[PDB]
């Protein structure tokens, strides 16, 4: 995350780190939606033109983290995936359309102060909050630009941008399963997701029940925090039937 801040302890208890077994290494972000499932971007597990195609075992899921590096001895939990499900119609060929994936953790993920699931939106919740101008929050241990990579979870709030502005910011074909966010050129401020933040949740707090909902998944961008450019996110609510289904 660019132009963010260090997260507070227990601010994002659903935040999950996708960790490379060997070479050990941070893959992407993710989110806990149940006590056995994890949400993330399909392209964190499957990107052929770059020969990326991780299996259930080349992987490890780390929950309740704060420090990007350290093994947080009695607060973090590690698990192994029992299976991965990529959206059958994920388009890594055209523009990262339907960039989604679940991970039936193989062993339960007992919760605690730093481990708690985020809510998945309902048609009405999505309806009232997914509006240009409404701010959302993205977290990740991503790049601090285009100490380049942080030491503790980063966080930043970004307004939703109207589809037309989003479309004429790029030459890639935007679909209905995406939405973009960030401040405008003139707005007089920045911030953005960046490399390493992918698969990370984009959340909003519902002013009606005072609950946090995952509206999107960090998918792609064009550079990091450049003027006239925006971050693209998977539209979680439009892909919800697919989610219920594999669950």
């Amino acid at each position: 995350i660019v132009e963010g801040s260090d997260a507070e302890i227990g601010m994002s208890p659903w935040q999950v780190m996708l960790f490379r077994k060997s070479p050990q290494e941070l893959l992407c972000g993710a989110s806990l939606i149940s006590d056995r499932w994890v949400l993330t971007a399909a392209h964190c597990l499957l990107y052929p033109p770059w020969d990326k195609n991780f299996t259930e075992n080349d992987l490890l899921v780390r929950i309740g983290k704060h420090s990007r590096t350290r093994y947080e001895r009695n607060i973090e939990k590690i698990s192994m995936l029992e299976k991965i499900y990529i959206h059958p119609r994920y388009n890594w060929r055209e523009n990262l359309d339907r960039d989604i994936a679940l991970m039936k953790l193989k062993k339960p993920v007992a919760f605690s102060d730093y481990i708690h699931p985020v809510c998945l939106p309902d048609r009405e919740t999505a309806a009232s909050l997914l509006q240009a101008g409404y701010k959302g929050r993205v977290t990740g241990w991503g790049n601090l630009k285009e100490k380049g990579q942080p030491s503790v979870l980063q966080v930043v709030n970004l307004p939703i941008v109207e589809r037309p502005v989003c479309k004429d910011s790029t030459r890639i074909r935007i679909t209905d399963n995406m939405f973009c966010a960030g401040y405008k050129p003139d707005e007089g401020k920045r911030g953005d997701a960046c490399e390493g933040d992918s698969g990370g949740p984009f959340v909003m707090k519902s002013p009606f029940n005072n609950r946090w909902y995952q509206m999107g998944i960090v998918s792609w961008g064009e550079g990091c925090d450049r003027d006239g450019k925006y971050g693209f996110y998977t539209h979680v609510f439009r892909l919800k039937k697919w989610i219920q289904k594999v669950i």
Binding site: G148, S198, V218, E222, G223
Partner: peptide, 19 residues
Amino acid sequence: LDPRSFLLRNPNDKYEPFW
């Protein structure tokens, strides 16, 4: 087309990151 790449207009491809 990940966050860290660039524009597709004339040049129809790209390279992976590093570092």
